[PDB]
Design an enzyme around this catalytic site. Sequence first.
Site, mmCIF file in Angstrom:
data_model
loop_
_atom_site.group_PDB
_atom_site.id
_atom_site.type_symbol
_atom_site.label_atom_id
_atom_site.label_comp_id
_atom_site.label_asym_id
_atom_site.label_seq_id
_atom_site.Cartn_x
_atom_site.Cartn_y
_atom_site.Cartn_z
ATOM 1 C CD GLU A 184 49.887 19.688 10.394
ATOM 2 O OE1 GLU A 184 50.407 18.938 11.258
ATOM 3 O OE2 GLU A 184 50.134 20.914 10.324
ATOM 4 C CB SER B 76 44.425 12.563 20.996
ATOM 5 O OG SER B 76 44.737 13.890 20.617
#
Length: 264
Positions: free
Chosen positions: A142, A44
Amino acid sequence: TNLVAEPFAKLEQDFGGSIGVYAMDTGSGATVSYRAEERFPLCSSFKGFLAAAVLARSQQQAGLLDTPIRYGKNALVPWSPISEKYLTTGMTVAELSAAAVQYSDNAAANLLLKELGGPAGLTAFMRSIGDTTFRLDRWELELNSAIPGDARDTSSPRAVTESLQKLTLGSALAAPQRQQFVDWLKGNTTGNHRIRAAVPADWAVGDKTGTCGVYGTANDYAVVWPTGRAPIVLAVYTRAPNKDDKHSEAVIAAAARLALEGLG
Ligand SMILES: O=C(O)/C=C/c1ccccc1B(O)O
């Protein structure tokens, strides 16, 4: 032999994997480097650079950041707490960007990625500021696969730190956009146990976390302002060889401590 590196090697051996560190003192030019040019999964942490790319686009599109976006349920993704909360309200581009940075909101990140032309569009923005290492290839979720030896969705601690410096302290963004990026990073809610745990409480910190989970893979990067001194920029990334190896926030904080101690 590298005596500076020995405490980092001991830390990664106890962790059971690899740690990558790069830190820059922007006042003196001093640096600390450990596996600094190796690739690690972004996870992230790409969402911070995503918000910066949106800010750059907003410089030449009047009112872009103030524009409301009314998405549907099909745009939602697991761990999208802000996007779900405002589903029946809508969100501005600025609010989506802040949610991606400060809560790691996955739906918000994918919506903004689409506006930029996808992972390739974000990669092109990073090339435009002089980062030749960063690559984003896939979308949430993903991009978190973190498979050892797979270069998809990776960068290096040194390239992350160099790009972070250009965007938060340098000239890569116009000043009002640079300031907004800093404000978003300073309001991050997800990083209290990582770099923030290694800095004195009276220092200002903006950061962005990443956690792939698998392969012991997690990270944090930050700009840190010691009171009345030139800022420090740093990045700490981890990975490990087995799929079910656990990441460690404590190891990230411990590496950040060593980096600050090693700076001149
Ligand atoms: O900010 C973090 O450390 C974790 C954010 C996150 C949460 C759920 C699923 C994927 C991610 B990310 O790292 O891509």
